[PDB]
Amino acid sequence: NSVTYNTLISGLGKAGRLEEALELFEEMKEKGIVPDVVTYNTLISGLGKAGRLEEALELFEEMKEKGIVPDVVTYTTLISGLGKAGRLEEALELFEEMKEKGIVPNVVTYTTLISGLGKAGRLEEALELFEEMKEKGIVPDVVTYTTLISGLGKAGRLEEALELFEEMKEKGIVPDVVTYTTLISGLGKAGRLEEALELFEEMKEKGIVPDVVTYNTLISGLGKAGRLEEALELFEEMKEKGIVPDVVTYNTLISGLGKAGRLEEALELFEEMKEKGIVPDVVTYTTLISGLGKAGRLEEALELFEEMKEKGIVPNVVTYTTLISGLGKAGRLEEALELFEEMKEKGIVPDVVTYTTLISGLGK
DNA sequence: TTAGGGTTAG
């Protein structure tokens, strides 16, 4: 029964049925049968990817207590989850713990830390870790390079991101659609959309086929350069090439339309995505709430905020800030303050944007 | 057989 139950949970986890996997896991522990490390790693990954990091860390504690020894996969998964949640110090603490326990980190472990460091803007530390990895005889692959290229591009260090891309090719590491898309994004964000479009052409000529993420990146870049009509033309064509738009495609176009004040069309796409089975998320609702509030349609923005909660979508700091900005600009400071208090009550931490927005409203 | 990279909102 131990092997059958473990294969089942590991199977369900692989199939993305986390709650069903968790159920059989509890059921196997009720019947006193011991879960294996693959089962624990699968559940820890699922929980981490669902944002349920405290539950992931609880399972990590549970396997240690039950005498199930964490391996490189266990630590790498948790380091990934902690890093994605901006909990860099804890991710690094876990990396120091695995090393003290004689568990050998590999290229995946190091790439995961490089990613978490780069996302927290600690790019120099990511560059130093990349040098450290090489000194230990760990060979970076296409994923490791792409990770750093992304960190560099996000800090607007495009000349260094392209230098690293050239170094990578010089070492015989072949770029894939992800490497090219990363650069297309970086270029597009640094006001170099034309270079990004030339690189997209050079990518295709090298036999690299774009995926939906490549298209979403081009759509984003076009919109930012005041070329929303070309973004919409690319989307209206995207379907013909067989590429299926996803939640991000819709979120990006909704943002572009909403920023241009073309709110009716943004809402048309919101209805179109729902008809096509594409499920709106926190980004979809927050983008529309911002579009509505900025166009003076504050009551609609507040009603959409109610709708979002009713659909089980959890508002974040971005959602609260856009409404605080909306309420503040309309002179509804009492409501903006209550919302600032409600957000704090839900454990949502304000950032500099939240503070400066609220001060601007109260200061008028 | 579980773990790493690219896209979107204030």
Residue numbers in the entry: 4 to 367
Quoted passage from the original study:
PPR proteins are RNA-binding proteins found predominantly in mitochondria and chloroplasts. PPRs stack on each other to form an extended solenoid structure that can recognise RNA in a sequence-specific manner based on the identities of amino acids at positions 5 and 35 of each repeat. To bypass these limitations, we previously used consensus design to engineer artificial PPR domains (cPPRs) that are highly soluble and, via an appropriate choice of amino acids at position 5 and 35, can be designed to bind RNA in a predictable, sequence-specific manner. In this study we have discovered that cPPRs bind not only RNA but also ssDNA in a modular and programmable manner, analogous to their RNA-binding capability.
Although these proteins are highly similar in their primary sequences, only cPPR-Telo1 gave reproducible and diffracting crystals. We solved the structure of cPPR-Telo1 and cPPR-Telo1 bound to its ssDNA target using single-wavelength anomalous dispersion at 2.1 and 2.0 Å resolution, respectively (with sample electron densities in Supplementary Fig. 8). Our structures provide the first pair of structures where an identical PPR protein compacts upon binding a nucleic acid in the canonical, sequence-specific mode, providing an opportunity to understand how the conformation of the protein changes upon ligand binding. cPPR-Telo1 wraps around the ssDNA upon binding, inducing a massive compaction of the superhelical structure and decreasing the length of the protein from 104 to 64 Å. This conformational change more than halves the number of cPPR protein side chains exposed to water and may be the principal driving force favouring nucleic acid binding. To allow the separation, an extensive hydrogen bond network between an arginine at position 16 and a glutamic acid at position 19 from one PPR repeat and a glutamic acid at position 18 from the preceding repeat in the apo protein rearranges at three out of nine possible positions leading to a more open arrangement when bound to DNA. Specifically, the side chains of Glu128, Glu198 and Glu303 form hydrogen bonds to their own main chain instead of to Arg125, Arg195 and Arg300, respectively. We observed the same binding mode in our cPPR-ssDNA structure and likewise the bases were sandwiched between the valine residues at position 2 of each repeat. An identical mode of thymine recognition is seen in our structure when ssDNA is bound and the methyl group at position C5 that distinguishes uracil and thymine is orientated away from the protein, such that it is initially hard to predict why poly(T) ssDNA is bound much less efficiently than poly(U) RNA, based on this difference. Support for this hypothesis comes from the observation that although the electron density is very clear for all nucleotides, it is weaker for one of the thymines (T7) in the structure. One interesting exception is the thymine at position 1, which does not make any specific hydrogen bonds with the protein in our structure.
